[PDB]
Design a protein around this ligand. Structure first.
Ligand SMILES: CC(C)(COP(=O)(O)OP(=O)(O)OC[C@H]1O[C@@H](n2cnc3c(N)ncnc32)[C@H](O)[C@@H]1OP(=O)(O)O)[C@@H](O)C(=O)NCCC(=O)NCCS
Length: 276
């Protein structure tokens, strides 16, 4: 007799079989099998294909459980109150933990809002990623955690999540920055976003822009703006204040950016008011 006690080595989510990057504390028994089923709508986990199918045939909505506060021809965003959808958000946090070195206790979702992004096509809604945000952040962080599901990574979705998070801050008349410390993947994504943002502003808005105009237009913090401007070598002093300025490098980067034909968030489609 060899009794095998296996780790969760693959999660089955729709047609995808995904390998976890890190341990996540799913409250399930460890056995000789190394898989679980994750319903791609409810995010519920099942040790058994039969149990999973039994619940799959139930009538459920085929998108995340919150208000659709943004909808364009490409994506929707749903705003979910952790306290109002405890089970679903707990399920989302267990799933997210498989791809994070650390995450706050998955069970305690009440303090968070979750902004969940779906792709819509002939088959309906497909959750591709989300960011959470503290209802009340002492440090003014505008994102707590952010995640694109591995099967959808490196398709541009992460950047859309980040862009959306700043559209909320702008509507709030606040600057914001993601919670630190940031994973390496998170930080590199933010740096690319910050860089594309300044580059786009310089070409489409104004050849020279003060740090405070940038902040007003983007909701980026002074610190993130300065760090990014220094990396791009575009920090100067002009008419008595610090600015960023356009040069041939920036223009070239912009053209390479446009050439990629990437989707962006349309602020006019965000139908949302801060809690006030
Ligand atoms: C951080 C994270 C959300 C980024 O998500 P993502 O959707 O992969 O991000 P994007 O696709 O917008 O950009 C990532 C890369 O893919 C590339 N990419 C995007 N679209 C592409 C396309 N159509 N073809 C080729 N490459 C593409 C980008 O250029 C970028 O490449 P680079 O890093 O070499 O510059 C993701 O890595 C993740 O969920 N990580 C684990 C969770 C985590 O660590 N979160 C941190 C907060 S707690």
């Amino acid at each position: 007799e060899v009794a095998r006690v296996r780790n969760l080595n693959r999660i089955i989510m729709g047609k995808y079989e995904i390998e976890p990057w890190y341990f996540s504390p799913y409250p399930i028994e460890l056995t000789d099998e190394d898989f679980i089923y994750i319903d791609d709508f409810t995010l519920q986990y099942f040790g058994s294909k039969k149990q999973y199918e039994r619940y799959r045939k139930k009538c459920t909505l085929r998108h995340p459980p919150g208000n659709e506060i943004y909808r364009d021809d490409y994506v929707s965003f749903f705003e979910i109150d952790g306290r109002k959808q405890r089970t679903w958000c707990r399920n989302l946090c267990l799933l997210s933990k498989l791809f994070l070195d650390h995450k706050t206790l998955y069970y305690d979702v009440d303090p968070f809002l979750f902004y969940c992004m779906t792709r819509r096509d002939e088959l309906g809604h497909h959750l591709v990623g989300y960011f959470s945000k503290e209802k009340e952040s002492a440090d003014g962080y505008n994102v707590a955690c952010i995640l694109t599901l591995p099967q959808y990574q490196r398709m541009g979705y992460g950047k859309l999540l980040i862009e959306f998070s700043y559209e909320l801050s702008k509507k709030e008349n606040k600057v914001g920055s993601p919670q630190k410390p940031l994973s390496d993947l998170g930080l590199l994504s933010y740096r690319a976003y910050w860089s594309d943002t300044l580059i786009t502003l310089l070409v489409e808005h104004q050849k020279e822009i003060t740090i405070d105009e940038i902040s007003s237009m983007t909701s980026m913090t002074t610190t993130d703006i300065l760090h990014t401007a220094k990396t791009l070598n575009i920090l100067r002093y002009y008419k008595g204040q610090h600015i960023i300025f356009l040069n041939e490098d920036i223009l070239d980067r912009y053209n390479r950016l446009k050439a990629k034909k990437r989707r962006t968030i349309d602020p006019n489609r965000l139908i949302w008011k801060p809690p006030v």
